[PDB]
Amino acid sequence: DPLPFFPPLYLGGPEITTENCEREPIHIPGSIQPHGALLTADGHSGEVLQMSLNAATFLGQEPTVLRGQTLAALLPEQWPALQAALPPGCPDALQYRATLDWPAAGHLSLTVHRVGELLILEFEPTEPHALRNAMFALESAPNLRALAEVATQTVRELTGFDRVMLYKFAPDATGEVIAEARREGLHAFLGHRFPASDIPAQARALYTRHLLRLTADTRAAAVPLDPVLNPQTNAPTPLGGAVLRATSPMHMQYLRNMGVGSSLSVSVVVGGQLWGLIACHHQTPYVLPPDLRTTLEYLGRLLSLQVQVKEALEH
């Protein structure tokens, strides 16, 4: 039965059990994963409102100094570019990316998107023809099976992940592993099917709009935003569009129990519906840098197109 979200934990909401799965407001956890930092800022003035508690250590500045400046002063070269790329009223799915040379922290990748009157800024550390070669190989795959196999093998070669599966949704939202590339010694998940509650309904809706999400370390504690609520609204900060957003504790226990240290997945979206997932596992924690993740994002789109094409060749 579909039911509306509970309030999050920090607003006195209940703790999540197997009973109330579909009602966890996973998009507003009030916290991020510790391998990057996040700031929120007023979309018109550029006043800095919220920051992750670890921000001082990524950005090399005291909180009170950060919060006391506008983005115009903090990001003089990027602030006008942000404002042109992310105009008021734009969708929350639109992202702008730049690379910064920050004194204390080396090269940072900056990813920005806009939710209403809020700008959300994510900072992460950042670092030949493999993509072009893959694009052509995907297109020349003769059928859906060969496409799925080429796609899994390519992603594994690009990333070094221990296990890469193509996980396809059935009409009842159960899912099945239809191809996989895996490290020697791992047991096969090929042909196994998994029940529709394994990836509940509010996560599938979110995965149709925001196409990549990850868990770099399944044992890492989440880092709170400070303050936790958006001071504009005294309400929760929407993080569904932020790759740094903390992962559901329910989902992290599910991965730990499987022996997974690091998890990543790309959505494959066909005709406006979530067709499947490029799902990756690593046994140890593992951070895939932003520019490599971009390659996977591009492959997500290519695969969406090629899945349509291969399936049309099939009636």
With respect to ligand LBV, which residue has the nearer C-beta, 232 or 294? 294
Q: Determine if residue 280 is labeled as part of a ligand binding site.
A: no
Sorted by sequence, the CB contacts under 8 Å of residue 275 that are 6+ apart come out as 168, 169, 268, 269, 304, 307
Q: Does 103 bind a copy of itself (CB under 8 A)?
A: no
Residue number, 16 or 85, with CB nearest to ligand LBV: 16
Residues 135-194 that bind a copy of itself (CB under 8 A): 135-137, 139-140
Are the beta carbons of 58 and 36 closer than 8 angstroms?
A: yes
- Strand partners for 263: 215, 281
Does 97 bind a copy of itself (CB under 8 A)? Our answer is: yes
Among 45, 57, 99, 253, binds a copy of itself (CB under 8 A): 99
- At its nearest, how many Å lie between ligand LBV and the CB of residue 26? 5
CA distances from 40 to 8, 32, 173, 237 (A): 19, 13, 35, 9
Residue holding tokens 């394994």? 198
Quick one: 57 or 140, whose CB is closer to a copy of itself? Answer: 140
Cβ 136 to ligand LBV, closest distance in Å? 20
Q: Which does 18 bind (CB under 5 to 8 A by kind): a copy of itself, ligand LBV, none?
A: ligand LBV
Question: Would you count residue 212 as binding a copy of itself (CB under 8 A)?
Answer: no
CB atoms within 10 A of CB 13: 15
Binding at 257: pick from ligand LBV, a copy of itself, none (beta carbon under 5-8 Å per type): none
Closest CB to ligand LBV among residues 41, 307: 307
Question: 52 is in the binding site of which of a copy of itself, ligand LBV, none (Cβ under 5 to 8 A by kind)?
Answer: none
Q: Is 21 a binder of a copy of itself (CB under 8 A)?
A: no
Q: Which is nearer to ligand LBV, 72 or 220 (CB)?
A: 220
Report the residue number, 241 or 290, with the smaller CB distance to ligand LBV: 241
CB of 121 to a copy of itself, least distance (A): 15
Taking contact as CB under 8 A, which single stretch among the options 52-60, 129-137, 150-158, 256-264 is the one that binds a copy of itself? 129-137
For ligand LBV, the binding residues (CB under 6 A) are 18, 21, 24, 26, 175, 177, 189, 194, 197-200, 203, 213, 247-248, 250-251, 254, 263, 265, 277, 279
Q: Which residue's CB is nearer to ligand LBV, number 109 or number 247?
A: 247
DSSP codes of every residue in the chain: ---PPPPPGGGTPPPP-SSSGGG--TT--SEE-TTSEEEEEETTT-BEEEEETTHHHHHTS-HHHHHTSBHHHH-TTTHHHHHHHS-TT--TT--EEEEEEETTTEEEEEEEEEETTEEEEEEEE----HHHHHHHHHHH--SHHHHHHHHHHHHHHHH--SEEEEEEEPTTS-EEEEEEEE-TTPPP-TT-EE-GGGS-HHHHHHHTTS-EEEES-TTPPPEEEESSEETTTTEEPP-TT-TTBPPPHHHHHHHHHTT-SEEEEEEEEETTEEEEEEEEEESS-----HHHHHHHHHHHHHHHHHHHHHHHS--
The annotated binding site for a tetrapyrrole is made up of 21
List interacting residues with a copy of itself (CB under 8 A).
85, 90-91, 93-99, 128-129, 131-133, 135-137, 139-140, 271-272, 294, 297-298, 301-302, 304-305, 308-309, 312
